Write a protein that binds this ligand. Structure first.
Ligand SMILES: CC(=O)N[C@H]1[C@H]([C@H](O)[C@H](O)CO)O[C@@](O[C@H]2[C@@H](O)[C@@H](CO)O[C@@H](O[C@H]3[C@H](O)[C@@H](O)[C@@H](O)O[C@@H]3CO)[C@@H]2O)(C(=O)O)C[C@@H]1O
Ligand SMILES: CC(=O)N[C@H]1[C@H]([C@H](O)[C@H](O)CO)O[C@@](O[C@H]2[C@@H](O)[C@@H](CO)O[C@@H](O[C@H]3[C@H](O)[C@@H](O)[C@@H](O)O[C@@H]3CO)[C@@H]2O)(C(=O)O)C[C@@H]1O
Lengths: 133, 133
């Protein structure tokens, strides 16, 4: 596994900033946000070459261990062998995922947790810094 | 009870940078480093006014759940209601906690672990940024 952070206490409107290095031969990496490994209000999974997919951003939720309905973005502003920053926040309706250069995605808040207390990173993505505004 | 990070995989030489907010009513705060909650190669505990200690830094280790012998430092470069920055490293001999202005606190490496996999904040210290350099 990669980095796992708990007790984040990330309230609505507060910002979680993660920056890491994407491997030159990356196939996929994951940012899991929620309450624990079984309860994720956001499964953020850029796939470079994984699960039959290529250069596709896959998001989903996991509620009580159960995956929800997958959603995919058309754009893919991630490059293997480069540094990537992802800023996440949320309200009662949506999680908002931003990237430093104009890119912004919305994903439905399906769990409606009080806060984001759990973050797990995995795959070809070496985290360099995490910041909690 | 504060931020807890695991799977850090911080090897000797690698630098852990932490920036946080010391509470205005700060009596004490803690940075725990090691393998897990029961195996800490460094218990870094600046005490403003706690457990009978005033403006004193208390370091210790925990090995298989058992606390070691406390080491105390006279120099106290911390202020309540402020921002504190520390950089942490270790080698075979010592753990080293560095502050920006030049302060350098050393604590003997008692556990001799391959890496720092675990970090936990506690007390009057709210972590705002963690970086791996
Ligand atoms: C054990 C293991 O390696 N865990 C992997 C888990 C799975 O549980 C895996 O099936 C175990 O063998 O899968 C991981 O990624 C999944 C996740 O990204 C979800 C998001 O919705 O999608 C899953 O793939 C989907 C695919 O998106 C769909 O097109 C359709 O094919 O269904 C498949 C499979 O249901 C991913 O497998 C995970 O993070 O949980 C990767 C783990 O390493
Ligand atoms: C960990 C937890 O759940 N609560 C706090 C604990 C408890 O008070 C502790 O388990 C019961 O005393 O206290 C914590 O800090 C302890 C730690 O800093 C050790 C370091 O060796 O010192 C303890 O105080 C010592 C003191 O330094 C000595 O001079 C003498 O007075 O003995 C006391 C008690 O042993 C601290 O209590 C901890 O992490 O264990 C802070 C927790 O929030």
């Amino acid at each position: 596994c990669g980095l796992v952070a708990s007790n984040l206490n990330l309230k609505p409107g507060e910002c979680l900033r993660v920056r890491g290095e994407v491997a030159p031969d990356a196939k996929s990496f994951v940012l899991n946000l929620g309450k624990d490994s079984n309860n994720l209000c956001l499964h953020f999974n850029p796939r470079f070459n994984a699960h039959g997919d290529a250069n596709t951003i896959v998001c989903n939720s996991k509620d009580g261990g159960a995956w929800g309905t997958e959603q995919r973005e058309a754009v893919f502003p991630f490059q293997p062998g480069s540094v990537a920053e992802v800023c996440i926040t949320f309200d009662q309706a949506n999680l908002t995922v931003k990237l430093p250069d104009g890119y912004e995605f919305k994903f439905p808040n399906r769990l409606n947790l009080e806060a984001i207390n759990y973050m797990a990173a995995d795959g070809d993505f070496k985290i360099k810094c995490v910041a909690f505004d």
